[PDB]
Amino acid sequence: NSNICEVCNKWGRLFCCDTCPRSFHEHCHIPSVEANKNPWSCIFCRIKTIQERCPESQSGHQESEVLMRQMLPEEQLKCEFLLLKVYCDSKSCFFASEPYYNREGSQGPQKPMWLNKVKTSLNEQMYTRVEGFVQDMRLIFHNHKEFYREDKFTRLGIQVQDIFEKNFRNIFAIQETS
């Protein structure tokens, strides 16, 4: 197994996957690492299995159909992965915890959103459709764009949203286009 966390790339107290060489801090993994379960498989391994059990799952999909899907166990899982994929980028540090808004010439968002809040929402089963998860994800970056305006710090929202969107297309097998 790896000696660093797959998500944050730091050593420390790590739980090793029994079916692949990745390791995780307790709270870096989504969902949080399960107390017992021997062997244990990580979310990378659980997502792999879904594709292997239904290879047709990787044919192209329309985003509109993906969003309207109900949050049954397999969609819940894919959203937990996608979220995890964003935390693997170090730049997610800027979007992780609750932000606050006091900049000259800007006004803060009507509806503030952050990754730890999305994380909590997923864990408490507050989304009924994929749409709800993806709306809040995108809200994160959209609030950052509007707030930071022409300050170059706005690029952090573009950068991190690109990670989100690429990984959304991958994980949910969105039909490729130009």
Label each residue of the chain as H, E or C. Answer: CCCCCCCCCCCCCCEECCCCCCEECCCCCCCCCCCCCCCCCCHHHHHHHHHHHCHHHHCCECHHHHHHCECCHHHHHHHHHHHHHHHCCHHHHHHCCCCCCCCCCCCCCCCCCCHHHHHHHHHCCCCCEHHHHHHHHHHHHHHHHHHHCCCHHHHHHHHHHHHHHHHHHHHCCECCCC
Does 88 contact Zn ion by CB under 5 A? no
Q: Taking CB under 5 A as the rule, does residue 163 contact Zn ion?
A: no
Contact status: 119 vs Zn ion (CB under 5 A): no
Tell me which stretch binds Zn ion (CB under 5 A): 36-44, 106-114, 131-139, 168-176. Answer: 36-44
Residue 79, interface with Zn ion (CB under 5 A)?
no
Cβ closest to Zn ion, residue 1 vs residue 106: 1
Return the range that interacts with Zn ion (CB under 5 A); candidates 51-59, 94-102, 155-163, 169-177.
51-59
Paired with 16 in beta bridges are 23
Q: How far is the CB of 16 from Zn ion (least distance, A)?
A: 9
By CB under 5 A, tell whether 17 contacts Zn ion.
yes
For Zn ion, the closer CB: 49 or 62:
49
Residue 30 makes contact with Zn ion by CB under 5 A: no
**Is position 160 an interface residue for Zn ion (rule: CB under 5 A)?**
no
Binding residues for Zn ion, rule CB under 5 A, total: 11
Closest approach of Zn ion to the CB of residue 9, in Å: 7
Shortest distance (Å) from residue 42 CB to Zn ion:
3
Residues found near Zn ion in the complex (CB under 5 A)? 5, 7-8, 17, 20, 25, 28, 42, 44-45, 54
